[PDB]
Amino acid sequence: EADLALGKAVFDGNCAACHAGGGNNVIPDHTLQKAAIEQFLDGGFNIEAIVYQIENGKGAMPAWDGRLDEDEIAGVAAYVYDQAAGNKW
């Protein structure tokens, strides 16, 4: 329902180019750690804010709407959430 295995596959295939290990190769302080998200992700540490930025992109981050389907976006958003919330990177 969440689907973290799906989300990890989507992450490794599309997001790890810039965020492997939970970092950010382009803007190094805008990482995928909880405290970074809470400060820098417009909308805060919430699934809808993660979704929104996946869909629509921001700056140097490309938009994924139409290139990833609804289940793929939901699952990668849930994987980022889970990795941040559990301190798993």
Q: How many CB atoms lie within 10 A of CB 63?
A: 13
d(CA 27, CA 10): 21
Coil/strand/helix, residue 18: helix
Q: Is 61 in the site for ligand HEM (CB under 6 A)?
A: yes
**Residue count at the site for ligand HEM (CB under 6 A)?**
26
Among 6, 58, 82, 89, binds ligand HEM (CB under 6 A): 58
Helices (H) and strands (E) in the chain, counts: 5, 0
Q: Is 6 in the site for ligand HEM (CB under 6 A)?
A: no
- Binding footprint of ligand HEM on the chain (CB under 6 A): 14-15, 17-19, 24, 26-27, 30-32, 36-37, 40-41, 50, 53-54, 58-62, 64, 76, 80
